Amino acid sequence: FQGAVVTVDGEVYGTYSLAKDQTIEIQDGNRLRIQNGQAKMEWADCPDQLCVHQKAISRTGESIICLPNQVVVSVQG
Amino acid sequence: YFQGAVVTVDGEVYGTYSLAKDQTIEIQDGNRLRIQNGQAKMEWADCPDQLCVHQKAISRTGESIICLPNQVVVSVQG
Ligand SMILES: [Zn+2]
Numbered sequence: 001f002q003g004a005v006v007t008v009d010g011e012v013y014g015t016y017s018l019a020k021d022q023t024i025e026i027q028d029g030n031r032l033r034i035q036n037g038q039a040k041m042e043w044a045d046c047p048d049q050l051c052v053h054q055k056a057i058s059r060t061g062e063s064i065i066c067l068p069n070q071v072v073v074s075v076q077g
Numbered sequence: 078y079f080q081g082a083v084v085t086v087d088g089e090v091y092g093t094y095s096l097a098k099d100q101t102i103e104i105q106d107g108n109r110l111r112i113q114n115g116q117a118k119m120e121w122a123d124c125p126d127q128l129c130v131h132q133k134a135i136s137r138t139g140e141s142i143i144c145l146p147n148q149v150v151v152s153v154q155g
Pocket residue numbers: 044046048049050051052065066067068069
């Protein structure tokens with residue numbers, strides 16, 4: 001399956017299918033929304049809010065990162 | 078203040094490299110980043126999937142290139 005791989009401090013947190021609408025609360029500091037086959041950072045407690053402003057991802061290799069919270073979201077097949 | 082490519086390996090910041098200067102960053106033995114014409118691109122990697130090498134060049138704040146097998150994160154900050 002094609003999913004959004006989430007790593008926190010370099011450790012794989014989980015892999016979430018893009019084909020299923022879901023909301024992932026990543027260790028209280030980030031919230032990922034999977035909707036219509038795309039992953040987007042819906043909310044974050046980081047000061048810069050850069051992760052929240054990155055465009056939704058759906059293609060293999062694409063990523064969303066929250067550097068202050070060491071969160072990496074990546075699309076893997 | 079400058080626009081640069083922040084490189085993290087295993088969550089540790091290695092450095093920030095100005096996008097305004099053409100340079101090659103050899104990130105340990107597994108990844109090589111090329112800064113050229115104000116853009117950062119993964120030129121080479123020893124990873125099996127080669128996904129980082131196929132990612133589009135980045136130049137805008139927040140944009141990223143990641144090599145998941147080698148725990149390399151490249152991000153534009155500033
Ligand atoms: Zn963030």
